Amino acid sequence: DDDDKLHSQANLMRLKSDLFNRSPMYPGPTKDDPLTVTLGFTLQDIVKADSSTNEVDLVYYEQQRWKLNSLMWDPNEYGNITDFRTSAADIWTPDITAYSSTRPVQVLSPQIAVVTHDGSVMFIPAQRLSFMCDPTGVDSEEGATCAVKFGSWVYSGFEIDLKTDTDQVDLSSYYASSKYEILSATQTRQVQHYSCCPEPYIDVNLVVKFRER
Amino acid sequence: DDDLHSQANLMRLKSDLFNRSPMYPGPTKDDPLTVTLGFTLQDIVKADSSTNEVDLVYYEQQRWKLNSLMWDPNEYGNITDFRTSAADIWTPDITAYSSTRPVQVLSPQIAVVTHDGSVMFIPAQRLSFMCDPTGVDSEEGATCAVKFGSWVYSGFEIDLKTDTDQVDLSSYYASSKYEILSATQTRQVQHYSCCPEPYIDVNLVVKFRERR
Amino acid sequence: DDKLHSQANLMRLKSDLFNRSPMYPGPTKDDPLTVTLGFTLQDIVKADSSTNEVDLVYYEQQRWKLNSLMWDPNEYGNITDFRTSAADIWTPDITAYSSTRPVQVLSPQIAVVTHDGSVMFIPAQRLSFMCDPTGVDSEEGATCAVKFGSWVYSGFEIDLKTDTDQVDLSSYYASSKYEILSATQTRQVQHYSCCPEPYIDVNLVVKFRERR
Amino acid sequence: YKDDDDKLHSQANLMRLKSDLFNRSPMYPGPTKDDPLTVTLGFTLQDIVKADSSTNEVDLVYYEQQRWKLNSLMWDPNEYGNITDFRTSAADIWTPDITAYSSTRPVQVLSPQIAVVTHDGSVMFIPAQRLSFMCDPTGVDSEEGATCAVKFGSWVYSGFEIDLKTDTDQVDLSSYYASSKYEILSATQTRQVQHYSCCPEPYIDVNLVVKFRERR
Amino acid sequence: DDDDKLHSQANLMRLKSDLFNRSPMYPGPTKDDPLTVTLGFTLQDIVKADSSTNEVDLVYYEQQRWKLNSLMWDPNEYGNITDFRTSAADIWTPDITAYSSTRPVQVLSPQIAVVTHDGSVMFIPAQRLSFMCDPTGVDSEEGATCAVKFGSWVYSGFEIDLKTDTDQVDLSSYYASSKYEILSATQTRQVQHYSCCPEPYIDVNLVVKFRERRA
Ligand SMILES: CC1=C([C@@H]2C[C@H](C)C(=O)O2)CC[C@]23CCCN=C2CC/C=C(\C)[C@@H]2O[C@@H](CC[C@H](O)/C(C)=C/[C@@H]13)C[C@H]2C
Ligand SMILES: CC1=C([C@@H]2C[C@H](C)C(=O)O2)CC[C@]23CCCN=C2CC/C=C(\C)[C@@H]2O[C@@H](CC[C@H](O)/C(C)=C/[C@@H]13)C[C@H]2C
Ligand SMILES: CC1=C([C@@H]2C[C@H](C)C(=O)O2)CC[C@]23CCCN=C2CC/C=C(\C)[C@@H]2O[C@@H](CC[C@H](O)/C(C)=C/[C@@H]13)C[C@H]2C
Ligand SMILES: CC1=C([C@@H]2C[C@H](C)C(=O)O2)CC[C@]23CCCN=C2CC/C=C(\C)[C@@H]2O[C@@H](CC[C@H](O)/C(C)=C/[C@@H]13)C[C@H]2C
Ligand SMILES: CC1=C([C@@H]2C[C@H](C)C(=O)O2)CC[C@]23CCCN=C2CC/C=C(\C)[C@@H]2O[C@@H](CC[C@H](O)/C(C)=C/[C@@H]13)C[C@H]2C
């Protein structure tokens, strides 16, 4: 019967209620309860390289994945619901930031995440980013090389650790008719040491080598 | 008192729907939703050959049906139909896949709800998307394409469809810098490595050239 | 100390109207609302022939009248009108049909409600819209038009009219880059193959040229 | 231990005062013909950033001083441990709807939107703004320069509800940017009255007239 | 077995809850309760120098630091937690403003502060700022000199004592491939009085000498 649809809605509603409007929520990672965030970029386009200001504009998808015990559930208690979509405001998200942007990142996609019964969150914002990049050599065979680091703004490696599944930037969705073609693009986790601080900070360094098509 | 009874019936209905009964948490695998999508292309504003971006203005017609929004007009003084702010209901997360700037909304964010639980939502939008306008200065013109789909829902939660593969050009701006040779909107089913579920988009293909 | 009671009188009035009473949920077929619309054209700021976009600054006068906003001044210390945030009341969704960028509001979003139930709301706006400015550098000038109308209501709900078909030019900026040769605002009735209901818009037609 | 004991008492008093003003008393409904308000307006001109002769728009940067007084914001400092004034977000109080009448773009606020309220009920509010307004800069490349003007007034209130006032007709140029592309020859702010056919009430504005030339 | 982690989260929720729900929140600095705010700059890039409007665009990190008794806790009472991060909207923050910006500041970093057990708040927004600056001489060896002041918009020196750790601007992460190189950058505390009024107003003057790069 079509009543099974009404039972599906009630089960989701109760699940969300149990995880948000009842269970003690998430204050962010701690030194004793650290969090690993998996990061990966899908480079869609180099829109603009500005040699009068040394800014380059990228469009990319930033894939983020982390896992919380306070988001786990048994699907058997909720009509075998295995995953659900929720607004990215309802849950805690990591403060992953580009370290050398020259204006605020523009969000191209709806700020919605996917939560899975094991406590997995997948969040993949499409973004347009202006960052510090000298495009000298872009009109040559060798091309120009630029880099931008992404990491937490406020957490050290003892609270947020970063990892990549791979060192290769996903280029399978690169705009085939861009003004610029990619010679190579890598994403490398770096354990970074600052003079201020005994504890290391983790970033992912995005190195893009490119030239005019 | 004729007016006052029709206003009270509307406020009662909106209450029953939006102060009860109880909520709507989006589509699921067991409770999937059909969103029908259609485009009315008004203008190609700008084709920047220095960055390969093209700016479109269009209306995006979205229609879907929720049982939680159904009512019997007989219970509410023959109200078959009402207007509501789009912030007050669930709407689908239909997104352009290759935009270069956040989409800019041109129209009031208001939807119409019919007693059959059907929702009609038609935002007007300006979109910048990835498009190489090479050839636009010629008789063959340039061809550009952009896909629209849910960002987060798969084909098992939202079934995207169209009523036609023909973009509505009946209000394309007659004095645009660009004339439309053709504009089509096509449903495609796509799979990604990570994931068993299908993902559905509508591909909008526009062929265009500079107006004489 | 009437100054103290003057405040409590207005406080009580706003309470009685916004609380106490059944809410006004907008117009319906059962209860159509006449909305009067008129433009005061202040400046043609910019005419872009690369994109066929023209930028206007104008005041958009909106006027309508409601039973649920009427009161007797004697009951409220001789108060005959009050100011209120436009966010606190229903306002009409009058939209440019061919803008190219979201309209930018230049004035505080505040309306004036009078005891006879009439609302005055006059947003100052900057609008980019579809206009071919060819011939602006000549004596005959260029001619462009843009239609304003409700996005979601038909003529059965919003009975849209103008008080005059002449655009107010009494404060068009005397040192503008462009001079106005004429500006008219004309109500039109249109029909669509979806809908039995008539649809109404106001067509702002501006003829203009480079000042010399 | 009268260290952070005085400090605790002073913090508690401040929070007691704000609570007594913004919770124990009904929300201020704005001025009326029987309870009218006088807003005192003065400008501090900081910079003429740009003069665009292809659109006839000029961009100004200035501080707009606004001051007014309300009985509902008065208090006795003795009942609140000698507190004479406090700072508050502009959003937590009523502020007048003073608007430029010939802007071509929405004003951009450069400063934090915070006001200062004094025990006599007076409020000081000084937002820094960038403004694009209608201005023909022909003459800017001359000795007498170019002259432009922009009126400021309430958008929805007549002079019977919000009266507008200046302390002086001289614009404050003591903070004008000395390396600006444009130098100021004069800047005045003059109160004006008129009537409209709609209404019997006087309508008031302050006309900011600026005379300027290219600095060389 | 090991869910002393449960727990670790419980301790932090309890702490934030104790500081934000069970104790009176700070109402801001006052005459009788003045605050010391320490301000410091890390210059990242001079993006753009516009000679037709006399505007220059800077990207910098603005270090802000202050200390409240009401944000102190005993780490022993909360499972040894010595610090936590929290949205900047949750706490009071200083209204430090550039005095000569020509566009509203743009924040580039998430608005999150770090609070330590002694009542310390560290808050470091990355910002892009357009300000008033005549870049004449930027194409020469001497370079051009520009300056911009930062201070409280609404508080006098009787409520906020503005301070620096040092007069040298941090250049250790200045973008090496910038269009402009830095010759010098100083941050100086200034006390000003206005004929208007008896209270002093404190600011930090950022003075940057810079020129076009020749790399
Ligand atoms: C210098 C610095 C960089 C530099 C900038 C350049 C593009 C780069 O690659 O690393 C990236 C952002 C980062 C390094 C990564 C962590 N965050 C910042 C700036 C924000 C710092 C905050 C909020 C507080 O100071 C942090 C340590 C202070 C440290 O000296 C500091 C300011 C580091 C910051 C920890 C935290 C308590
Ligand atoms: C690669 C990709 C595209 C590409 C871009 C190009 C224009 C195209 O045609 O498809 C459009 C958006 C989409 C495909 C359509 C659905 N969403 C995305 C990106 C957002 C993805 C989110 C939130 C989650 O990851 C998805 C994994 C699928 C896949 O690897 C992935 C990131 C697909 C995304 C499932 C979903 C739970
Ligand atoms: C085609 C159309 C135009 C055109 C564009 C051109 C400048 C013109 O003159 O009219 C302007 C906006 C309008 C004109 C009529 C009112 N609204 C629209 C688009 C928005 C429509 C919505 C939200 C729903 O469809 C409406 C009827 C559908 C109709 O075919 C339709 C799409 C009309 C729209 C009613 C309402 C339930
Ligand atoms: C004509 C006009 C101007 C003109 C524009 C030019 C730069 C000037 O100096 O005055 C600036 C804004 C103002 C002048 C006075 C303040 N209001 C406006 C526009 C907004 C008006 C509203 C909301 C209602 O009409 C007002 C009076 C009607 C009057 O004819 C009217 C529309 C005046 C408006 C009062 C109020 C009830
Ligand atoms: C004149 C002035 C400047 C100028 C600009 C130039 C770069 C400079 O060094 O000082 C920068 C901002 C400041 C100086 C420091 C305090 N803030 C302002 C402007 C905002 C002032 C407000 C909100 C109220 O008046 C303040 C004191 C009045 C004082 O005369 C005044 C208007 C000072 C303001 C305190 C407060 C109650």
Query: Measured between alpha carbons, how far is E59 from A132 in angstroms, rounded to an integer?
Result: 10
Sequence-separated (6 or more) residues with CB below 8 Å from residue A80: none
- Kindly list the distances between the CA atom of residue D182 and the CA atoms of C151, D53, E54, in Å, as whole numbers in the listed order: 45, 14, 10
Cα B150 to ligand 2 centre (Å): 9
E102 reaches D (C-beta below 8 A): yes
Asked how this structure was determined, the answer is X-ray
A154 reaches E (C-beta below 8 A): yes
Is residue A10 within a helix (H) or strand (E), and if so which, with residue range? helix A3-19
CA distance E109 to chain A (A): 7
Q: Which of B203, B186, B188 is nearest to B147 (CA)?
A: B203
Query: Measured between alpha carbons, how far is C142 from D57 in angstroms, rounded to an integer?
Result: 22
Query: Measured between alpha carbons, how far is D62 from A79 in angstroms, rounded to an integer?
Result: 62
Query: Measured between alpha carbons, how far is A184 from A176 in angstroms, rounded to an integer?
Result: 15
Query: C-chain residues within 8 Å CB-CB of B43?
Result: 98, 100, 130
Q: How many CB pairs under 8 A join C and D?
A: 79
Q: Find the radius of gyration of the CA atoms of chain B.
A: 20
Query: Measured between alpha carbons, how far is E199 from D85 in angstroms, rounded to an integer?
Result: 14
Tokens linked to E208: 């940057």
- Tell me whether residues A9 and B99 touch, CB distance under 8 A: no
Asked if B148 contacts B37 with a C-beta cutoff of 8 angstroms, the reply is yes
Tokens linked to D147: 């002259």
Is residue D15 within a helix (H) or strand (E), and if so which, with residue range? helix D4-22
Query: Measured between alpha carbons, how far is B38 from B60 in angstroms, rounded to an integer?
Result: 6
| A149 Cα nearest atom in ligand 1 | 9
Q: Indicate the residue type of D63.
A: Y
- Tell me whether residues A102 and E128 touch, CB distance under 8 A: yes
Q: Return the half-sphere exposure (C-beta side, CA atoms, 13 A cut-off) of residue A14.
A: 15
Query: Measured between alpha carbons, how far is C204 from C147 in angstroms, rounded to an integer?
Result: 6
Is the preceding peptide bond at B21 cis, omega within 30 degrees of 0? Answer: yes
Strand partners, B50: none
Q: How many CB pairs under 8 A join D and E?
A: 84
Q: Which of B26, B69, B25 is nearest to B157 (CA)?
A: B26
Find where tokens 């002393």 sit: E4
Find where tokens 């709800």 sit: B113
Asked if C117 contacts C66 with a C-beta cutoff of 8 angstroms, the reply is yes
- Kindly list the distances between the CA atom of residue E102 and the CA atoms of A138, B72, D130, D151, E131, in Å, as whole numbers in the listed order: 33, 58, 7, 21, 5
Q: How far apart are the first and last CA of chain A?
A: 58
Is the preceding peptide bond at D154 cis, omega within 30 degrees of 0? Answer: no
Dump the DSSP string for D150-210: EEEEESS--TTTEEEE-S-SB-B-TT--TT-SEEEEEEEEEEEEE--TT-SS-EEEEEEEE
Tokens linked to A121: 């969150």
Q: Which of C107, C109, C119, C108 is nearest to C82 (CA)?
A: C119
Q: Report CA D171 to chain centroid distance, whole Å.
A: 13
D85 is in an annotated binding site: yes
Tokens linked to C212: 């010399």
Query: Measured between alpha carbons, how far is E32 from A87 in angstroms, rounded to an integer?
Result: 44
Query: Measured between alpha carbons, how far is E9 from E15 in angstroms, rounded to an integer?
Result: 10
Helical ranges in B82-184 per DSSP H: none
Q: Which of C204, C184, C44 is nearest to C126 (CA)?
A: C44
Cα A208 to ligand 1 centre (Å): 22
Q: Indicate the residue type of E136.
A: T
CA distance D9 to chain E (A): 10
Helix (H, G, I), strand (E, B) or coil at D50: strand
Asked if C151 contacts C92 with a C-beta cutoff of 8 angstroms, the reply is no
Helix (H, G, I), strand (E, B) or coil at A125: coil
Query: Measured between alpha carbons, how far is B40 from B59 in angstroms, rounded to an integer?
Result: 5
Query: A-chain residues within 8 Å CB-CB of E47?
Result: 53-55, 102
Find where tokens 């996903």 sit: A170
Q: Return the half-sphere exposure (C-beta side, CA atoms, 13 A cut-off) of residue E169.
A: 25
Q: Which of E30, E35, E37, E69 to mutate to test binding with chain D, by most D CBs within 10 Å of its CB? A: E30
Edge to edge, what strands does the sheet with A180-192 contain?
A96-98, A144-152, A201-212, A180-192
Asked if A121 contacts A38 with a C-beta cutoff of 8 angstroms, the reply is no
Task: Show the domains of chain B with their CATH numbers.
Answer: 1-212 (2.70.170.10)
Nearest CB among D34, D104, D157 relative to C43 is that of D104
Query: Measured between alpha carbons, how far is B148 from B37 in angstroms, rounded to an integer?
Result: 9
Query: D-chain residues within 8 Å CB-CB of C133?
Result: none
Query: Measured between alpha carbons, how far is E37 from C51 in angstroms, rounded to an integer?
Result: 50
Which chains have at least 3 CB atom pairs separated by less than 8 Å from chain E?
A, D
Helices (H) then strands (E): counts for chain B: 1, 12
- The torsion of the CA quartet A18, A20, A23, A26, rounded to 10 degrees, works out to 150
Helices (H) then strands (E): counts for chain E: 1, 12
Cβ of C122 below 6 Å from ligand 4: yes
Query: Measured between alpha carbons, how far is D61 from E100 in angstroms, rounded to an integer?
Result: 9
Resolution (A): 2.4
Positive or negative: CA dihedral D79, D83, D88, D93: positive
Which residue in B has a C-alpha nearest to residue A112's C-alpha? B152
Strand partners, C206: C144, C183
Query: Measured between alpha carbons, how far is E113 from E83 in angstroms, rounded to an integer?
Result: 11
Q: How many CB atoms lie within 10 A of CB C122?
A: 18
Q: Indicate the residue type of B94.
A: I
Sequence-separated (6 or more) residues with CB below 8 Å from residue E22: none
Helical ranges in chain B per DSSP H: 2-18
Positive or negative: CA dihedral B123, B128, B129, B133: positive
Sequence-separated (6 or more) residues with CB below 8 Å from residue A161: A34, A35, A36, A37, A202
Q: Which of E6, E108, E124 to mutate to test binding with chain A, by most A CBs within 10 Å of its CB? A: E108
Query: E-chain residues within 8 Å CB-CB of D130?
Result: 102-104
- Kindly list the distances between the CA atom of residue C128 and the CA atoms of B157, C107, C125, in Å, as whole numbers in the listed order: 38, 17, 10
Tokens linked to E177: 């491939």
- Tell me whether residues D136 and C104 touch, CB distance under 8 A: no
Sequence-separated (6 or more) residues with CB below 8 Å from residue B175: B211, C52, C130, C131, C132
- Beta strand A35-50 with A160-163: parallel, antiparallel or unpaired? parallel
Query: Measured between alpha carbons, how far is D27 from D75 in angstroms, rounded to an integer?
Result: 16
Is residue D66 within a helix (H) or strand (E), and if so which, with residue range? strand D57-74
Find where tokens 């039972």 sit: A7
D77: left (phi over 0), alpha (psi -120 to 50) or beta: alpha
Nearest CB among B22, B30, B134 relative to A8 is that of B30
Strand partners, E140: none
Helices (H) then strands (E): counts for chain C: 1, 12
Query: Measured between alpha carbons, how far is A105 from A128 in angstroms, rounded to an integer?
Result: 6
Query: Measured between alpha carbons, how far is A190 from A200 in angstroms, rounded to an integer?
Result: 10
Ligand nearest to the CA of C122: 4
Query: Measured between alpha carbons, how far is B85 from B62 in angstroms, rounded to an integer?
Result: 15
